[PDB]
Amino acid sequence: LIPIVVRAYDIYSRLLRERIVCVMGPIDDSVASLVIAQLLFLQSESNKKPIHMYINSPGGVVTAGLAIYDTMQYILNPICTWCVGQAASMGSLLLAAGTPGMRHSLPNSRIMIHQPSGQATDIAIQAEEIMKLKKQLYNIYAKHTKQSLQVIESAMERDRYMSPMEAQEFGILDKVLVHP
Amino acid sequence: LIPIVVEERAYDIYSRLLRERIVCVMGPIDDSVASLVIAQLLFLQSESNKKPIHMYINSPGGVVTAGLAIYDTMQYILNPICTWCVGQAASMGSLLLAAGTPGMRHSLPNSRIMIHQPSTDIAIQAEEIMKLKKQLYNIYAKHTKQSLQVIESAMERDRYMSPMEAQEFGILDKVLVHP
Amino acid sequence: LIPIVVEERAYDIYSRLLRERIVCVMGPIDDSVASLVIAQLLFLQSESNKKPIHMYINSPGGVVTAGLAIYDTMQYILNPICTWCVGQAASMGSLLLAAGTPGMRHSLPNSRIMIHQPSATDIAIQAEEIMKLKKQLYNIYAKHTKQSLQVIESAMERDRYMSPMEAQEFGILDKVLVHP
Amino acid sequence: LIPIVVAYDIYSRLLRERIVCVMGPIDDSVASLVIAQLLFLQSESNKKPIHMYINSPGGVVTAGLAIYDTMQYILNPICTWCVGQAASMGSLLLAAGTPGMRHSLPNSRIMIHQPSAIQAEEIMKLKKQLYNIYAKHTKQSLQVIESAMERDRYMSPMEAQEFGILDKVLVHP
Amino acid sequence: LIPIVVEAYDIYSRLLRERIVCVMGPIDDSVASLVIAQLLFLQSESNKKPIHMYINSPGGVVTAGLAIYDTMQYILNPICTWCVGQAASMGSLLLAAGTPGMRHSLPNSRIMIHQPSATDIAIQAEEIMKLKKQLYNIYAKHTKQSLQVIESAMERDRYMSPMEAQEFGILDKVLVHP
Amino acid sequence: LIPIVVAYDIYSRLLRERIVCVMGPIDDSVASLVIAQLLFLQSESNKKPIHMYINSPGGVVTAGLAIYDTMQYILNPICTWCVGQAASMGSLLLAAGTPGMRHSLPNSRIMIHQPSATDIAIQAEEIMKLKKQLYNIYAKHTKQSLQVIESAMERDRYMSPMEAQEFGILDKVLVHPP
Amino acid sequence: LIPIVVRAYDIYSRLLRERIVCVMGPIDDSVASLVIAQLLFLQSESNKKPIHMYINSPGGVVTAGLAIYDTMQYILNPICTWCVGQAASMGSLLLAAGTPGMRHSLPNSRIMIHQPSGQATDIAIQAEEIMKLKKQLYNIYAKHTKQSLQVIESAMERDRYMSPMEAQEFGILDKVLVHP
Amino acid sequence: LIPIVVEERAYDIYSRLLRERIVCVMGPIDDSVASLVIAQLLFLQSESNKKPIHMYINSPGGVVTAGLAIYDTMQYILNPICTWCVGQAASMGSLLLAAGTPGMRHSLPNSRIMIHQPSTDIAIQAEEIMKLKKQLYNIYAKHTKQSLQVIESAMERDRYMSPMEAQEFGILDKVLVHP
Amino acid sequence: LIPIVVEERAYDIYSRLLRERIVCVMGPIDDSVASLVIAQLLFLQSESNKKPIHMYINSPGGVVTAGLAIYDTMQYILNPICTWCVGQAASMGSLLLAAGTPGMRHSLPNSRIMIHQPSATDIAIQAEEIMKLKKQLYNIYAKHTKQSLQVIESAMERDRYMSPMEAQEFGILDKVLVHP
Ligand SMILES: N#Cc1cccc(CN2CCc3ncn(Cc4ccc(Br)cc4)c(=O)c3C2)c1
Ligand SMILES: N#Cc1cccc(CN2CCc3ncn(Cc4ccc(Br)cc4)c(=O)c3C2)c1
Ligand SMILES: N#Cc1cccc(CN2CCc3ncn(Cc4ccc(Br)cc4)c(=O)c3C2)c1
Ligand SMILES: N#Cc1cccc(CN2CCc3ncn(Cc4ccc(Br)cc4)c(=O)c3C2)c1
Ligand SMILES: N#Cc1cccc(CN2CCc3ncn(Cc4ccc(Br)cc4)c(=O)c3C2)c1
Ligand SMILES: N#Cc1cccc(CN2CCc3ncn(Cc4ccc(Br)cc4)c(=O)c3C2)c1
Ligand SMILES: N#Cc1cccc(CN2CCc3ncn(Cc4ccc(Br)cc4)c(=O)c3C2)c1
Ligand SMILES: N#Cc1cccc(CN2CCc3ncn(Cc4ccc(Br)cc4)c(=O)c3C2)c1
Ligand SMILES: N#Cc1cccc(CN2CCc3ncn(Cc4ccc(Br)cc4)c(=O)c3C2)c1
Secondary structure, three states: OOOEEOOOEEHHHHHHHOOEEEEEOOEOHHHHHHHHHHHHHHHHHOOOOOEEEEEEEOOEOHHHHHHHHHHHHHOOOOEEEEEEEEEEOHHHHHHHOOOOOOEEEOOOOEEEOOOOOOOOOOOOOOHHHHHHHHHHHHHHHHHHHOOOHHHHHHHOOEOOOEOHHHHHHHOOOOEEOOOO | OOOEEEOOOEEEHHHHHHHOOEEEEEOOEOHHHHHHHHHHHHHHHHHOOOOOEEEEEEEOOEOHHHHHHHHHHHHHOOOOEEEEEEEEEEOHHHHHHHOOOOOOEEEOOOOEEEOOOOOOOOOOOHHHHHHHHHHHHHHHHHHHOOOHHHHHHHOOEOOOEOHHHHHHHOOOOEEOOOO | OOOEEEOOOEEEHHHHHHHOOEEEEEOOEOHHHHHHHHHHHHHHHHHOOOOOEEEEEEEOOEOHHHHHHHHHHHHHOOOOEEEEEEEEEEOHHHHHHHOOOOOOEEEOOOOEEEOOOOOOOOOOOOHHHHHHHHHHHHHHHHHHHOOOHHHHHOOOOEOOOEOHHHHHHHOOOOEEOOOO | OOOEEOOEEHHHHHHHOOEEEEEOOEOHHHHHHHHHHHHHHHHHOOOOOEEEEEEEOOEOHHHHHHHHHHHHHOOOOEEEEEEEEEEOHHHHHHHOOOOOOEEEOOOOEEEOOOOOOOOHHHHHHHHHHHHHHHHHHHOOOHHHHHHHHOEOOOEOHHHHHHHOOOOEEOOOO | OOOEEOOOEEHHHHHHHOOEEEEEOOEOHHHHHHHHHHHHHHHHHOOOOOEEEEEEEOOEOHHHHHHHHHHHHHOOOOEEEEEEEEEEOHHHHHHHOOOOOOEEEOOOOEEEOOOOOOOOOOOOHHHHHHHHHHHHHHHHHHHOOOHHHHHHHHOOOOOEOHHHHHHHOOOOEEOOOO | OOOEEOOEEHHHHHHHOOEEEEEOOEOHHHHHHHHHHHHHHHHHOOOOOEEEEEEEOOEOHHHHHHHHHHHHHOOOOEEEEEEEEEEOHHHHHHHOOOOOOEEEOOOOEEEOOOOOOOOOOOOHHHHHHHHHHHHHHHHHHHOOOHHHHHHHOOEOOOEOHHHHHHHOOOOEEOOOOO | OOOEEOOOEEHHHHHHHOOEEEEEOOEOHHHHHHHHHHHHHHHHHOOOOOEEEEEEEOOEOHHHHHHHHHHHHHOOOOEEEEEEEEEEOHHHHHHHOOOOOOEEEOOOOEEEOOOOOOOOOOOOOOHHHHHHHHHHHHHHHHHHHOOOHHHHHHHOOEOOOEOHHHHHHHOOOOEEOOOO | OOOEEEOOOEEEHHHHHHHOOEEEEEOOEOHHHHHHHHHHHHHHHHHOOOOOEEEEEEEOOEOHHHHHHHHHHHHHOOOOEEEEEEEEEEOHHHHHHHOOOOOOEEEOOOOEEEOOOOOOOOOOOHHHHHHHHHHHHHHHHHHHOOOHHHHHHHOOEOOOEOHHHHHHHOOOOEEOOOO | OOOEEEOOOEEEHHHHHHHOOEEEEEOOEOHHHHHHHHHHHHHHHHHOOOOOEEEEEEEOOEOHHHHHHHHHHHHHOOOOEEEEEEEEEEOHHHHHHHOOOOOOEEEOOOOEEEOOOOOOOOOOOOHHHHHHHHHHHHHHHHHHHOOOHHHHHOOOOEOOOEOHHHHHHHOOOOEEOOOO
């Protein structure tokens, strides 16, 4: 039951006019394909006007999440990340991949970087190869939070969520706002 | 739910991707995908048979004959084809990736490329699956410019490659971070 | 989601294929697929009875009477019917492929062509009727491949797939091409 | 999805050609659809012939009888066409065409044998209706229809023409 | 599970020793096979000692009910029938197939002869008429009613009282106590 | 629950009567059990007759031929009995009894028409090759011509016990013990 | 509903006393484990008394069928094979593996050596490796029917059944009996 | 349906196999199989801790920790253990096969041996599955007497070996046709 | 099928295990598993209250109250309880393993020991009650490992498995042996 706003759009097509790419729910190849297209389209309108990326996600397929991350680094626009409700697993990696100084979170959000043990693989993968994927998140997290590799590997072995202030000091987000 | 963009006409974002001469290959490859992909490749040729066409690949593989149908159409049309790998391209997905126009096969830094065949259509006999696998042997060796047994060995290995190993191996030409 | 192309008018890409006089026979063939193909075949003739009609065949087979229904329409209309095998043409697919206008039956370089029938039909069927069906499959195959009736009874007993070059040598198609 | 011709969809264009399709199993939903178009094509013209495309394995008898009564009610000449097969109730509509205008394409299969909650006496009562319909349009005696419908087999289009189910077996116009 | 009685049998094997054959529940080929074997076993014990049958059945496959009916008419033992709870469709045909004067029913039972709308395969129209005509003749032979009266009463989708079924001919005695 | 007689279960005592029970659809499991009892009953005596009880709707053709071949292999004379029905493979086994010892009860239903399964999906020439095997067995035991058999089996109908007797499927139609 | 015969056994335990190993139905690891135990037990009673192996099977897992074959060659007893009803795929390979001159079939049996295209693999296997398994049946069939490798490979490409007389001339069985 | 044999006692054929000091390992390996196999290995030791025990292996693999539990019990008891491979022994199945007493690891001529791990218990983390795989690396190298990386390479290969290659590789000692 | 052993009397091998004073805790632990273990525990004590009792633990965990029910019985009875970890002991499995008599908690060389609880119980449960349960898990773990309560709160936050040597160093078991 999606509404229509006023030439008349639906509320989700209107969100894209305000340069807002929506990432709600589990991440798969279909979500990654839709998100990457919105980013590439938004750069075609202007490669300097900022883009806001709303994240309320529990995670999902890693390669699908990495495709969004790789596209976030490709486009030249300033990328603003907003954590609403929760950003866990791959969701917190996209949250931490925003433009430095523009990664926000709402005051009552939860943030998880631990990886779950409901998909995460597309096909069946071998023992050495989930380790290579985990090492990829090890370096991406360390690069965007400016944390050491050992601190990152240690923190990701603990099954717990952080408050936006804990995530701020760790390096996932920059500002915790209740109001503009 | 597919959003709508305005650039006066109103397209869905995927009808707008086809406007950019961009053909998406996301997900498992079956006869439904092969019918959709081939149609866009034939349409994009009709608009202009010399402008390049971009193929985005994030696929785990799938039906072999459908992936071979796309590949044949890729070699049939006259446009230079740029391949782009985001996320992953495993089994038949890496074959289409390596089948791009030489010099314009790209991948993004965190993609995973697998050429090991998994384990499609109706079940067949042992001589037919072995016949099909040798076509995958020849096609890979044709575009990687590797030896046959070098390909046959690398395909036994249950493993993915980083975009860089796939570049030295001959599946890719460029690994980009930024334009 | 089926994409949209623009001339001016907005078409769906499959509807644009029909304006190029291309009739797709993709996937398993049943009565619903037969209805669509026959409807498109008869419409393309009403526009012009001499302009060629293109048939895209990527099929693993299907119901015999449904596949025969199409073949009956391909023989009825006066248009030159170019058959194109892309991917594979098995069981009822190769019969339609071999039923194209002589000299205009093509195949793409990596296609597989089988004439072996699978080990069906709409309602449960008797012994004498199944062999009556296979006997008219022999006659149509022998008519269009110009082969002996027993050479069609043979080789159809072989659980085997053919190359486009074998299928060209045997009489199913006339050309196998890489480029136009 | 069904394509678009010029702006019509291919099955709406087939209706503009005065062609009514009866493809697949016949039930009350299909019978309601066929009857609606049969009355519309008569509403457009009561003289122009109407073409019926039959590719059916049969279906519900009361639904097939519903179509049959409508073709007898309407005043238009009706051409039936068999493509693929016409089995059980499907061959009854095929034989229900206007005399001299019942066709079949060469490689079709015609079945009049009926496939093996109402009482037993109602099954026999419905069957006798089927017997009389077949005998009326085939000009065959009742015991010939009863003995032939008893045989679990399909016919060639040439066999079905001599029996009286159809009139024309053509390859080209 | 079924309990164990000591005299050590399970109770259903003990009803066998009392020459009681149970026809409880729906009738299929598995029930007919079990019932016929119990009948033929009791004739081998003594062809003269009566056999008691307990019928609490909603009906079932017609050919299975005929194999039971043909087996009781085969053996020469005196066969009683006892309607407990309900005897509908094939159940009431067997109930009426008892030895004349020895077909009983308990007072609060329901007896039905109208046939439902019986499948091993899907059959043709004349084959369900051929089968129904067998039910007509079997009912008329044991109820001593005219064939027309059978066709009328079987067309009514209704249940009979054990009192009504007595004067119709389906049973002989409606008792509360021995 | 199968009752117990005195310690046998009723189906084990049927085997002691030299009776082999073939009730229900015929598959490879039914064929294995039936063949096992036929060879056992031959082990205890190669000349005493064996009794076969047939209430079958048909089943797998190769399993039904597996039984038939074993009925022809053993040296014992075989009485076949039809109760309820004998259809498709069931009527072929019924017809394959010892000449003059194939019986049926009066309310049985016998069909030789084959249904429109089998362990694997097979080809056209194999399904028809199997039908010719049935053509020869039916003509052999009914002593009818090949054309008369292949015509009559394309009829979708059942026969009465007397029709099948005149056709050659069975010999005696009994109501009470001879 | 398995009967009891007379000390009292069940009819299947009695079959083993007559030195009859029963192979009915599709073949899996459970059937192979049960069959191999009966063969090894029967050799422990006497390594010279013959063993009869009843076969009414449509096939099954290849490695499970090969385990029975390998055990048939291990034990020293004369092995008699009996085809009843049908022996297809792996079933006909065990039928052909009997002691020379002791492979029988009942007069109305069907024999298939073609391999189906309902299991045949335990796990998932690669393209080259089904070829190695097929080459194993290629040599086993040729060794026991004394046929050439080319004749064996050709005959196994045809989807058809043979009569016991066809199978006798080919080399699967030695005698076709109606009576001892 | 398990038959009954007489040799006076009445056993089922599998209770008679345990009488021969024969332990069967057929089918997928889970905690139910590990509980059954370990119990027989411990019982057969109690009857006599020096008589050999025979293990028949026709398994496609399965749960790793259950297959490791059996292997540990194999090394724990004091009896020499003969392993026998019929049909196949893939993944954990070949590990138990190679874990027999040196000199008595056999296979029949038409068996297939796979040491490539497939793709068990609850799902785990990437460091734990990698930790488990290295125990399979050490155990295989211990009984094959091969190098670690030689094992690690051979385990990438999606392939089976004939009993003869498995013999040169160090998983087997003897390949028999007849006693 | 559970095999049969013979002394003389015929036992099923699992019943023979109970006569060796061995109680198996294999698989997931629920109320039905708790009933069996407690019943076997109390019976073995009725025969003798000083003879050791052996507990075989190959468990991935289960219900907390069901697992606590066993631990309560292990503390109640007077017998020396030797715990044996074979394969794995995770969640409630390691708690029973660590609850064995001091000096008699063993593990086999290739076992995995986890104390991390999974991300349950019989009926749907509230927040305060789940933490009340984890708090008594802390107390039992701290009592038997002789570790600090916070050292138990830590490390239990780590989605991690331990070796038998780590579990010995931490206090879950006392010995890790290859041979008796
Ligand atoms: N997966 C994917 C992916 C991710 C990052 C970069 C690329 C490279 N490609 C190559 C071809 C191309 N062509 C046009 N544009 C502009 C545009 C305009 C509108 C829309 Br709607 C979409 C794109 C591009 O940005 C690119 C970048 C691929
Ligand atoms: N499977 C398929 C397939 C794949 C490759 C080539 C062909 C050959 N065919 C034959 C007829 C034809 N006719 C028109 N065009 C132009 C066109 C314009 C618009 C659209 Br929308 C699609 C195509 C063709 O490209 C071809 C090629 C078949
Ligand atoms: N199944 C079917 C089928 C197959 C072959 C031949 C026929 C015969 N029929 C009879 C009536 C008819 N009426 C009009 N046209 C032209 C037309 C115009 C638009 C569309 Br859209 C479709 C057809 C015909 O071709 C025919 C041929 C039936
Ligand atoms: N079931 C039904 C059915 C079948 C046959 C005949 C009838 C009788 N009815 C009664 C009323 C009626 N009113 C208008 N028209 C013309 C018309 C115009 C457009 C459409 Br669209 C449909 C019909 C009629 O034909 C009839 C015939 C009922
Ligand atoms: N369906 C069936 C059926 C129904 C009625 C009659 C028959 C005929 N048969 C033939 C052979 C036979 N042999 C022995 N007895 C005695 C007996 C003893 C114990 C048990 Br337990 C079962 C039977 C017979 O009654 C018959 C009758 C078959
Ligand atoms: N399928 C099957 C089948 C069918 C017919 C004949 C045979 C041949 N076999 C071979 C070996 C054999 N050995 C012993 N006996 C006697 C016997 C005794 C008790 C039982 Br219990 C079962 C059999 C045999 O009859 C045969 C006949 C197989
Ligand atoms: N899979 C399996 C299989 C198949 C063929 C041969 C072997 C080798 N084994 C080794 C140990 C062994 N020990 C005792 N016996 C005799 C026997 C007695 C009774 C029964 Br019951 C079972 C066997 C043996 O035959 C063997 C042969 C394994
Ligand atoms: N999981 C498990 C497992 C695996 C290997 C070793 C052990 C240690 N345990 C400890 C207690 C014990 N007590 C008696 N015996 C002898 C025996 C006698 C009959 C049967 Br039946 C089973 C065993 C033992 O072998 C052991 C070994 C545990
Ligand atoms: N849940 C439970 C449970 C757990 C711990 C303690 C108790 C207390 N109960 C009370 C009554 C009782 N009565 C007899 N015995 C001895 C015995 C003998 C044979 C078997 Br078999 C089992 C026990 C007891 O140990 C107890 C202890 C309950």
